[PDB]
Amino acid sequence: VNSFSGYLKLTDNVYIKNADIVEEAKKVKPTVVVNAANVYLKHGGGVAGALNKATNNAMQVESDDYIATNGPLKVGGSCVLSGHNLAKHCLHVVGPNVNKGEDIQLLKSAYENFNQHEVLLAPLLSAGIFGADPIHSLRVCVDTVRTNVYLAVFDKNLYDKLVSSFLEMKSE
Ligand SMILES: Nc1ncnc2c1ncn2[C@@H]1O[C@H](COP(=O)(O)OP(=O)(O)OC[C@H]2NC[C@H](O)[C@@H]2O)[C@@H](O)[C@H]1O
Ligand SMILES: Nc1ncnc2c1ncn2[C@@H]1O[C@H](COP(=O)(O)OP(=O)(O)OC[C@H]2NC[C@H](O)[C@@H]2O)[C@@H](O)[C@H]1O
Ligand code: NA
Ligand code: NA
């Protein structure tokens, strides 16, 4: 369906909305929802816990089965699994965990995976539990992704700070 509404257009292909990503997925029924994951697909808190909780833990069982068969992901890597009741597909992407000293440059590698999908509902990778600057995560997204990406930012204060930062980045 991909029926997105109420987004602010930042560039030709990046959009942003002050919204919860699970509530957006339930309203839009997208082809692809992005999970901000770790390499073992152990869905803890933040976006990963929210999506898994909305699938009634189905996402975790599937991920456990995927990892057992295939082994862990690499940082900057991804895998496509079921979106369960939220989306057709879920793209699990691993941003660098800068809190564990992983290389912030792998955020470029992480967002590159979006380019295999016509349209995506996504969060800001690495910007929460993994400790990257949200503004920096938005910049890499804008500089790296060429396909259609609708970003869900649930916190209204972060959203307002992100837009103001983006305007500053664009005019300077
Ligand atoms: N109507 C509604 N129902 C249910 N859940 C909702 C709703 N609206 C929003 N949400 C989302 O439920 C989520 C509850 O908060 P939570 O899952 O705890 O997110 P976090 O605050 O942990 O975000 C993770 C990271 N952000 C920066 C910090 O470093 C955290 O590590 C939060 O994202 C809300 O936006
Ligand atoms: N429900 C929801 N909707 C929208 N945006 C959200 C939500 N929950 C968190 N966020 C925001 O999305 C951003 C991504 O943070 P997070 O979900 O912690 O992902 P990370 O890439 O930083 O960390 C990944 C790790 N968290 C649990 C996973 O199992 C990974 O180990 C950050 O700005 C959060 O405040
Ligand atoms: Na900054
Ligand atoms: Na604000």
Residue numbers in the entry: 207 to 378
Question: What do the paper's sentences say?
Answer:
In Coronaviridae, including the betacoronavirus SARS-CoV-2, the causative agent of the COVID-19 pandemic, the macrodomain is part of non-structural protein 3 (nsp3), a 200 kDa multidomain protein encoded as part of open reading frame 1 (ORF1). To this end, we obtained the crystal structure of the S2-MacroD bound to ADP-ribose and its analogues ADP-HPD and ADP-HPM (characterized as potent inhibitors of the related poly(ADP-ribosyl)glycohydrolase (PARG) enzyme).
On the other hand, S2-MacroD:ADP-HPD and S2-MacroD:ADP-HPM crystallized in P21 with four ligand-bound molecules in the asymmetric unit and were refined to a resolution of 2.0 and 2.3 Å, respectively. The overall fold is identical to the S2-MacroD:ADPr structure with r.m.s.d. values of 0.155 Å over 155 Cα and 0.152 Å over 149 Cα, respectively. ADP-HPD, which retains the 3′OH interaction typical of the ADPr, is, excepting the missing 1″ OH interactions, indistinguishably coordinated compared to ADPr, whereas ADP-HPM, which lacks both the 1″ and 3″OH substituents, has greater flexibility in the S2-MacroD binding pocket.
